[PDB]
């Protein structure tokens, strides 16, 4: 008796734990050695559409180069400092002209090209480091921004609560899908060259994710329903509940072992040379979600209800009052 599913090939891009493989809201799914010291870094295979980092105590945006050095304002942003020749930011055409001598690379789509490019910055003169930096591509600009800071969140309430006695300062931020991020995509070193066919992007008009049971597409058994004025608001929530590699045990006064837990590598004059190390009860990893979270949403446009779930969907129901969305998808775009 047939156990198979004619939806399987279609829904493979919605098997987010397999195709993406890392956190989405916070991606820190791999470790890499740099000059003898292991650090966390992004490693999801799929692009994250709409995603950026909000800085809390600053007016400086996250695509602004990192700090110390007269240039892009105050405590800096997250991006690579100016090189000669300028390697970040780089536009699509500048990028294509750079790698003109390379057949595979020069012809990549704008997103895998940005990821590959970002992957050419070596960390801390360790020529053989497996450690590669993430990137943000801006589709309005055609600009690829390489990220020097790979951290995505530092903001516990008792040091980071907003402009008022935080204890006052050094770096409060969180990933978000803000409206001014619509044209941005968050790219790990691992963004696959064929994400365009194995990864999610546009939302599905007139479709509801379901489960294939007994030759029929049934509703997701277990959902959590949230109000959301529009699809944008639903995607923001789905993203907010998604796979997360943040040390989802929050820290106090920032220690070195916990700075690295959050994805930091430097203090900007040296590295973060932690000389204790976790050899006890870890497996060197416990905050890798490998893509497990509330990554999917069914948005009902009639009831303005975001129905959010944590099991992979295996078929689609045709329902004209729905839009199917994922944490990875563009927050606004529909097909």
């Amino acid at each position: 008796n047939y156990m198979g599913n004619p939806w399987t090939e279609y829904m493979a891009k919605y098997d987010i734990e397999e195709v993406h493989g890392s956190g989405i809201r916070v991606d820190l799914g791999e470790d890499a050695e740099v000059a003898g010291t292991q650090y966390r870094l992004p490693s999801g295979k799929c692009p994250v559409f709409g995603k950026g980092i909000i800085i809390e105590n600053s007016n400086t945006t996250f695509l602004t180069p990192v700090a110390t050095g007269n240039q892009y304002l105050k405590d800096g942003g997250f991006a690579f400092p100016p090189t000669e020749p300028l390697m970040s930011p780089m536009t699509l055409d500048e990028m294509r002209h750079f790698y003109k001598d390379n057949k595979y690379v020069k012809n990549l789509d704008e997103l895998t090209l940005c990821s590959r490019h970002a992957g050419n910055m070596i960390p801390d003169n360790d020529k053989n480091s497996n450690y590669k930096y993430p990137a943000v591509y801006d589709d309005k600009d055609k600009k690829c921004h390489i990220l020097y800071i790979a951290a995505q969140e530092n903001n516990g309430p008792r040091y980071c609560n907003k402009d008022e006695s935080k204890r006052n300062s050094m770096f409060c931020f969180r990933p978000a899908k803000d409206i001014s991020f619509q044209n941005y995509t968050y790219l790990s070193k691992n963004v696959v060259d064929n994400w365009e066919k194995v990864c999610p992007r546009k939302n599905l008009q007139n479709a509801k994710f379901g489960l294939w049971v007994d030759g029929n597409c049934e509703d997701i058994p277990h959902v959590n329903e949230f109000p959301a004025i529009d699809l944008f608001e639903c995607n923001k929530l789905v993203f907010e509940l998604s796979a997360s590699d943040q040390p989802k045990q929050y820290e106090q006064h920032l220690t070195d072992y916990e700075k690295i837990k959050e994805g930091f590598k430097n203090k900007n004059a040296s590295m973060i040379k932690s000389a204790f190390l976790p050899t006890g009860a870890f497996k060197a990893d416990r905050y890798k979600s490998h893509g497990k979270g509330y990554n999917w949403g069914n948005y009902n446009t009639e009831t303005q209800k975001c129905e959010i779930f944590n099991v992979k969907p295996t078929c689609l129901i045709n329902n004209s009052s729905y839009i199917a969305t994922t944490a990875l998808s563009h927050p606004i775009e529909v097909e």
Partner: protein
């Protein structure tokens, strides 16, 4: 910038010698460092070679070329060797250089058969 790697194929004898050459063609960037990597047939994941002993490397930064010489060849040397350039990348502020992964060679497929 592309990496011109020769020879593309070497069929050699145990005890003989091999000289792989790599030239950085179309480089606007100065050569800072170099790397070599092999894929032995059997595996396809790429091991970073340790320069030392029978493995002797010459770098000429001036002419942006560089070469491996493997002497007294063994069957364990069989595999596809690839060189890679790493560029110095000055930053428009400090004085210190960033490293920048260069393009890879097309490869050298080496064979070190004995009496076969």
């Amino acid at each position: 910038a592309w990496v011109d790697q020769t020879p593309r194929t070497a069929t050699k004898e145990t005890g003989e010698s091999l000289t792989i050459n790599c030239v950085l063609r179309d480089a606007s960037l100065e050569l800072k460092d170099t790397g070599w990597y092999r894929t032995k047939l059997g595996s396809t994941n790429e091991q970073s070679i340790s320069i030392g002993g029978r493995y002797v490397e010459t770098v000429n930064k001036g002419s942006k070329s560089f070469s491996l010489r493997i002497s007294d060849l063994r069957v364990e040397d069989s595999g596809t060797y690839k060189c890679q350039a790493f560029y110095s990348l000055p930053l428009r502020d400090y004085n210190y250089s960033l490293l920048f992964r260069g393009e890879k060679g097309a490869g050298t497929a080496l064979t070190v058969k004995a009496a076969a």
